[PDB]
């Protein structure tokens, strides 16, 4: 039986998001990609470097906004701009979200030597697609 990225059926009490509910074969069919860049197009270079950067940015934001992320990150690159779009919860005070936005944008801009912007969308609770 296939296991990869499959949330398994339970008793109907496990809330899953839209992303978690779709196995890999639905990628590009029912769900899109979480990162968009040109490195994986035919005739394009530097796919390895973009991939490592994406793995770091996902771990960095998970630990920088602990318990606040309500879904996976969406990473967008246009030219040298890096846009991080995150859906977060409404538990932390707004002052702490502004501190971490200023802190994260600045630290990441100096780390990867590019203008980095962080876009936060707040939700009252994790959006539930279905109960498995």
């Amino acid at each position: 039986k296939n296991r990869a990225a499959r949330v398994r059926v339970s008793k109907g009490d496990k809330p899953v998001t839209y992303e978690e509910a779709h196995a890999p074969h639905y990628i590009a069919h029912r769900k899109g990609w979480l990162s968009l860049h040109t490195g994986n197009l035919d005739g394009e270079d530097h796919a390895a470097e973009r991939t490592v950067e994406d793995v770091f940015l996902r771990k960095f934001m998970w630990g920088t906004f602990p318990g606040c992320l309500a879904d996976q990150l969406v990473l967008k690159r246009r030219g040298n701009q890096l846009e991080i779009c995150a859906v977060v919860l409404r538990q932390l005070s707004p002052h702490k979200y502004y501190f971490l936005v200023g802190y994260s944008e600045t630290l990441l801009s100096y780390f990867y030597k590019c203008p980095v912007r962080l876009h936060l969308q707040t939700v009252p609770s994790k959006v539930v697609y279905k109960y498995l």
């Binding site: 002052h95 702490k96 501190f99 971490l100 802190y103």
Partner: protein
């Protein structure tokens, strides 16, 4: 390696071993069982070992109408914070350890005679 690190959920699912041929048929018994613990429970965003005070994250942003600057707790002032977190951690462990004992039934290991409470309220605002 930083890239070999996993999330807390992944680490507990592995360590607990709740899914497996051991837990399928109760092939494994648990006199000693790994118990899940939430390690982010008493943790404050912005608090680290070095004891830095970040205005707007772990200390107030404005003090006396003026914006606070970056500061660091003294070595002694930081020891107290660390000790206080350990005591707060043992207090939490003791609060969970303090659980009200329920009366026994016909015998200590018997279910017979134990009260289960009133039946659940029916859908149409019925109560028992």
């Amino acid at each position: 390696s930083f890239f070999t690190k996993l999330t807390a959920d992944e680490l507990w699912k592995g360590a607990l071993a709740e899914t497996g041929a051991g837990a399928k048929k109760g092939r494994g018994k648990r006199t000693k069982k790994k118990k899940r613990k939430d390690l982010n429970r008493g943790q404050i965003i912005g608090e680290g070992r070095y004891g830095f005070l970040w205005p707007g994250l772990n200390v107030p942003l404005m003090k006396n109408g003026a914006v606070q600057t970056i500061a660091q707790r003294s070595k002694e002032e930081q020891e107290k914070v660390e000790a206080d977190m350990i005591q707060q951690r043992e207090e939490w462990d003791r609060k969970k350890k303090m659980k009200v004992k329920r009366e026994r039934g016909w015998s200590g290991n018997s279910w017979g005679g134990i009260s289960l409470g009133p039946p659940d309220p029916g859908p149409c605002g019925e109560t028992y």
